[PDB]
Amino acid sequence: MEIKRFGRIREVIPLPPLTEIQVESYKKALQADVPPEKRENVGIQAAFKETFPIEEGDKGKGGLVLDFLEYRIGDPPFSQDECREKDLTYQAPLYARLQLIHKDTGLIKEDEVFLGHLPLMTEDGSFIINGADRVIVSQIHRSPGVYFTPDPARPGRYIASIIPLPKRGPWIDLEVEASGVVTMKVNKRKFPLVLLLRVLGYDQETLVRELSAYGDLVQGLLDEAVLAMRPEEAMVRLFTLLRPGDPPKKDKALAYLFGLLADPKRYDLGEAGRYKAEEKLGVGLSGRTLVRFEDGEFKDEVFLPTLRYLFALTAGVPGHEVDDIDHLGNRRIRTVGELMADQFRVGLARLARGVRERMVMGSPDTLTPAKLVNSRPLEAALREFFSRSQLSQFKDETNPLSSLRHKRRISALGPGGLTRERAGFDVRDVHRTHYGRICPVETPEGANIGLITSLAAYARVDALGFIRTPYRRVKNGVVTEEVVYMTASEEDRYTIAQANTPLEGDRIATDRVVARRRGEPVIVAPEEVEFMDVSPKQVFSLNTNLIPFLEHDDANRALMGSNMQTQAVPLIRAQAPVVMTGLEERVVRDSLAALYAEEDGEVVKVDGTRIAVRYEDGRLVEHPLRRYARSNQGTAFDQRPRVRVGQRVKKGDLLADGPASEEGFLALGQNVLVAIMPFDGYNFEDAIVISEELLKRDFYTSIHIERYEIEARDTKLGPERITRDIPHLSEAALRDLDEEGIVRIGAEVKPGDILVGRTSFKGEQEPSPEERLLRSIFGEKARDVKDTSLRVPPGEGGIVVGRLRLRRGDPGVELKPGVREVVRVFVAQKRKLQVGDKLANRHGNKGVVAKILPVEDMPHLPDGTPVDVILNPLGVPSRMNLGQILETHLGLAGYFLGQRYISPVFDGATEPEIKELLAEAFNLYFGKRQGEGFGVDKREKEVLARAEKLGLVSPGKSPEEQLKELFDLGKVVLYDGRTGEPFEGPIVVGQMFIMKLYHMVEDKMHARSTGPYSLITQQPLGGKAQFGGQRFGEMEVWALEAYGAAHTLQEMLTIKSDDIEGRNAAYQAIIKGEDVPEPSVPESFRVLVKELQALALDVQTLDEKDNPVDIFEG
Amino acid sequence: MAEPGIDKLFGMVDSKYRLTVVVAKRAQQLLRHRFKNTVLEPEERPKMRTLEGLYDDPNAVTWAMKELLTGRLFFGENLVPEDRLQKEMERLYPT
Amino acid sequence: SKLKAPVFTATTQGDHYGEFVLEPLERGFGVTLGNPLRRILLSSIPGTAVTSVYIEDVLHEFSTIPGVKEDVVEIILNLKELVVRFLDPKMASTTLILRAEGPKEVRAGDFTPSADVEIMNPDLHIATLEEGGKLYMEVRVDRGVGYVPAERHGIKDRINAIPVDAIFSPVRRVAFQVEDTRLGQRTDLDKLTLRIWTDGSVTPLEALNQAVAILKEHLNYFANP
Amino acid sequence: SMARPVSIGEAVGVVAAESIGEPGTQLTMRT
Amino acid sequence: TEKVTQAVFKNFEENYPFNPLYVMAQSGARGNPQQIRQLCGMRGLMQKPSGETFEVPVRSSFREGLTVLEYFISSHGARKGGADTALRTADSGYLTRKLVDVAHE
Amino acid sequence: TQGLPRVIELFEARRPKAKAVISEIDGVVRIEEGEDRLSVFVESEGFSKEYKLPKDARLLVKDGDYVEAGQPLTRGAIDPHQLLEAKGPEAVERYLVDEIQKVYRAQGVKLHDKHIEIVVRQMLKYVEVTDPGDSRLLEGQVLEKWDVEALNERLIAEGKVPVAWKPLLMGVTKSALSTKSWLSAASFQNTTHVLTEAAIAGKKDELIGLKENVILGRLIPAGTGSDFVRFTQVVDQRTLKAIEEARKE
Amino acid sequence: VVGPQLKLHQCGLPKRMALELFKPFLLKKMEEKAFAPNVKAARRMLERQRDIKDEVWDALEEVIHGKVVLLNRAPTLHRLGIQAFQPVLVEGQSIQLHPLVCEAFNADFDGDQMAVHVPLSSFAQAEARIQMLSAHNLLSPASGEPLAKPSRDIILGL
């Protein structure tokens, strides 16, 4: 189908590469392909240079130095797939080349040393960690610098916050107390500030000079003439107070740290630490908070002018102002590369500690490198991160958009940066300053609302990790071709113009110009303007940006629609929507879920499993197509070819489609004809009515793959064995297993059916005599082996797509101790719609299928076609998701006019334009009618008449023109399939894009009556033959109490859970047909009495008149 | 069309839950003695409808409720001793 | 296809009002039968009702006859509630004469006791007159089809006679419903319950049987020329 | 809420708690 | 803002008494006046995320779609309300639980 | 404060945010100095009370106003603790209810007063001792545990003392813990102590309430499980004339 | 899912799930009603992969007759988060809930699920019908006002 574009404002720049944050960071923290001479700090190089000139105990005295020279990343031992198949971290050996030096000089430049294994990234953006794809999600935290803030605990006061780059120094707080005292806080220890100043040579006078003026605040700094005396004697008493136990004069040892040297405090090299404090504090700075080693003393750098600024802020200079701990000029992103390198830094600082211990031990003339290095610290520290840190997610794989979204995810919680899910409110709020940097829609609904967030579309993270947006420059009048990505900080300085603003050619078009400056909306002179917006897209996330008529959607329902799309399960007949925002080409492409040509050539080999192409010279590549794989989420992602054997190629046009892709256009669901009316309570509340005609067309039907696993271990009683000779079993049972004990490819597998056969030994006593006499005499000889196979969980199953086996010792395979051999079986299902499936559109209209109607019913147009979904209107005006309506109307045009559309966000279709398209479309739909020899049947009229009385049609006009009007208005006369009559009053009808979601009734829903009760708790759970019981929570108990439901409650606590005696009395009773039990004494009572006795404490029962009663006697 | 005349039932008792406790105990005795207990027997007995039709309604609870609103039954807070009310019940074909 | 041919119960009153249930039925044919029937039921079952009234001394649709407590309309409406059936099977129309004495209650039976015409509902209130009661009547009764009101036809007989609404349709109300009965594994097979309401003239079972014959009769026409 | 006098046995204490507490679902947390 | 509303509802009443939106919101079906007036009239004055009221009102009305800035300014409020629910919801029945404990007997 | 925070604030019965001042005694008003520090006097012949107000105080009484004991003077919340001891437990009760409904009402909810009434009754359920009868004079005891030891040690076996008490404003959660019932007191955080204290003393339960009975899985003492109903038996007419034929042999 | 065809006092209940739910109940019924001689041979003849006889669904219905299920949804915020219903054998895999009952339950047909419980003692069963039956619980216990009342869509028509 053909394509119709909409709206003005052309984009000066295309969208950034999208997976930027992820891909382009690691690369530059990894400096993989750059001569080891040029490699220039931050990343792996940093962590190395950070730690490395490693002097020995007694520095430069006992010999032995050891220093960094260069590092080499290896070649990964296994293929990208080999790793996933054999559960491996896709890694590479990082050796580092180091030279050891003596006091008598050694040039022992040991030929590299293994330092540990380093995981590395896909082309995609993701990692592989023991099989399974993973995402390192990027975190936000306060940016290093000096800050202030008002005292929340102390009304009308101010604390002073000193923040270095994380895991490189501690939090320092100055806070003038309601008791004169000033106190420096640090390491969660609090000491009088003076001490630290006394160390920096601050006399009781130079304080009265630089820090009196504003108020008598120095009063509590001064009355401590107790220690304003000797610098060295200060150093000791501080050392004493801070980290106690050991009080001599070598305090300089500790005090050197949070002073000079990039040991801890390197708030910045050439970054914000200075810059920020050089702009927010009192100018002039170098690198670390206070410079230590000058000529033995400790010279000040930051501490005083902070204490100054704080003081000049409780009365203070106008222009001295509190800090916005929320401004995106103080919120940075930590990209993957940064977090990995930060963990790489932990490794070294652990290896160093180890190296330091060993140089001392060994004889100084024997020790080389390789002989000093641990290779287990780094290996472990890098291992721990990628596997175990909260910032290391699984991978949202449901559809190709999901994965993409998952990369540009910004978190607030997790490690280091530690916001607990039990904090913040303004930390949740959308800040003016998110504009263009973070989406003001597209957050999660409950609990996380505000703390998890997505990256704005055109936005990008910069060198020091602040998000920047693009703004066009305006040379007073003209709108330049030059764009500038700028800080949220470097932004509060200009009169920025909206992109809405019109332009005759390349210059402004009206004297009243809409614009924001420092946030608040302002109307401004065409000269006043300093920058422009590039596109409205700029403002929102990708998923937001996927919503056709966002204009007319209320923000709240728009978030639901912005999500959910993530939840869209790829369909067999995926199809891109009839109405788009354009963005759908690129989201597929950047996801790399789809294949594309390399260098314009010609295709040669085109079949199900391969596309190979003769390129322009370039040699020859075959590209394999992943086929019916399985997502992280059971999604089943697969590629389909879209090119002809022999044709010239598009320098990089679609070679093969993805999973949610139709012709390289994001296809997350289907477009379908909808009626907007109530049915018969069948679309009540939010329910939806389906035309079974959908199922027939294999429309909303999706493929899902599940995977099953089973292990084999050795134990005291013998080895568990993956046999095919399972005891006590028919040949009917084994019918489908190869000579091995594993199911065949392509087996229809039912619930209960054997998936993988395997036999534990188990020695439950030794068969008593007598019962061996019979066992021998009658033949059936005793056995040493149990059934313990796999078998299909109740309700699961489908057709057996793939098997897979890793036994102990296999090439690169290592599996957990005391286990040998792992079997995995993959089963596939084809789904179709069902009563209880969830369908939603991009405007946030969710709802479940409640009724599939046979074609006989279903509202149908006069020409004969019935509609496909009946969507209740009452779910419209409550929420204000008005776009969904707008989108249906165009979809009616499109249906007859036979086209697709592209109406981008805040710059798409305008009513008149749709109406014109509708007018054009009706001349056809009725053009047909009258051409095939028909028109306005008695039913249509009946309606039209009462329709003008409603006031939708023009009285005076002819029934034909009356029909046109009504049509054009997006409405039309509809017929009840059930009774040949019409519904009086026209119905709005059209084509609508809807998606089928993650959740299906298939995966929900169980019924239990009796089954495996646990040997631990003794209540129902575990389901070896059937599923497991529903739980009765505290709130359900209150309700039963609130009713008069005595027994019904008691039942739920005794004969239905752990009350074995009566539990069984129940079952027996019904089998017989007896009125259940009457559990006289509840077990849980007896169990109470006793657990108490086993502690002493008499605990004794008494009846009415008050004589011991006894509840036991068993 | 909810329950067989349920409003008329509440009226008989002093407290809601009495009706509940009686309807239970009557169904309880009704259940044990294979329905040979009825006070409504004749053509008043409650019935079902099938692929055949008109088979006795199995639910003992139902029976108690219809049996109760014929007045015939007598419930009480304390008249007749239980230890002698259990044995005397086996009079016309017991369990 | 499976299953079997259905059962037709008919719990009946005895003149007006009948219930009818065609039970187990393929998923849909509840409406596929009940709907067309309903239509025909209220629309083609031939009947007989009042059509034109002349009353002595003054005319118009709105008036008050002195000596008569009611007013022309309440007479005219009462009239409409009068049921009567035609014996002589080729009768097309009749006229009814009413002679009203002194102080009295005038029933429908106080009409002319002419045969060829049995008055179905003779205990009708017609009208009441006080002392010195003069009311003479001449009302045309007519064979017709549906509901054909006074505005369309304009039945002339005299010049002081006023035409009435013609409710010739012995069914005065029809309503049906289609729930769904279990049948073994199948829980969703249709169960159609038709409920008819008539006057005196024609019984409901009759109405339905007529109605089924009519649609059966029309379906026939669909035969190649 | 049979719009009668109460029957003895109604565990009102709890009916009270729910009754009071459920509409706290629509009670603003922003203070 | 108040007059647009009270005269969107004047219109409906006087011509179009059977309008879906109207009829729904006049009966107890769904909808309400503020909702309606956000669809047909004007969304009105908006609060910044810090209490203060944005002195440029959202002049537009869903039907005639609102715009980028109009959209953005009217987003701060959407969140410091959608969090209000989620913070009330997460606390299971904290208050009912307190209550059930003092009273159950 | 408003919304759900306020509902807690009332039930938990705490010194509220904005502790609006209330006159300890009745007399006349005498506001003085609107500049340096602001203060409202309540005075008669005899007593003369001085209340010093924050300045930011939104007091709504103009000078020389007449006034009632315990009546608000500064506007905002009343500390229902200050109210109790200065106007009564009954008077406190009626305040609480009236004030909670206030929130529920103004947000839009309708629910019976008698509901809130029941809970507020428990918030008062307790009393502290003055001059004891057979215990120590510091104990916190249930109001109608010390009712049998009040007008019964005077109804028959008179002597010793009727036991003098004072009302106490327990805050719903704190009125929760202090229950006669070790069983339910246990479920709560500190379980050792309950079981310690309780075992040392004879401590019988009685299983009055619900939670208790549930803990042991016993049959709830309400509804079908209320002594008032549970004992009801049912007998047939033919069966009743099987007792006329068997009770006189 | 919504259940508009059912009476106020009726229930959703996928036959498959109603079958498992009452299984023991159905086992003796299968004995008493002829066909299947052993209670164990009955369990065999339902289990045996699948495909249940017409004669069994016929029976399931005769067990179910007059008994109720407790439905229950979400945060059970008042007694009314638990109601009692006479269950109705249904096509498909979704419990279908009456549109009136939504008010109290605060269910919405946009993804919500409900859980179902079967009481066993004639006591529990009585207890459930008489006191907790949806159709016996018409007015709110908070304020005598109607809780099961015409709503959203029912009002539209009227």
Ligand SMILES: CO[C@H]1/C=C/O[C@@]2(C)Oc3c(C)c(O)c4c(O)c(c(/C=N/N5CCN(C)CC5)c(O)c4c3C2=O)NC(=O)/C(C)=C\C=C\[C@H](C)[C@H](O)[C@@H](C)[C@@H](O)[C@@H](C)[C@H](OC(C)=O)[C@@H]1C
């Ligand atoms: C170590 O990873 C965990 C961290 C725990 O620690 C902890 C404290 O820190 C967290 C961080 C740092 C997050 O960034 C995060 C998150 O973004 C998120 C949810 C909760 N999301 N859900 C909302 C609704 N729902 C019905 C299900 C899940 C989270 O809880 C967390 C989270 C935590 O809880 N999600 C969202 O809001 C959005 C926008 C999308 C989610 C998409 C899919 C569903 C997930 O990404 C899948 C692919 C997995 O990645 C997760 C399941 C991870 O589980 C593992 C081990 O794979 C989990 C993040």
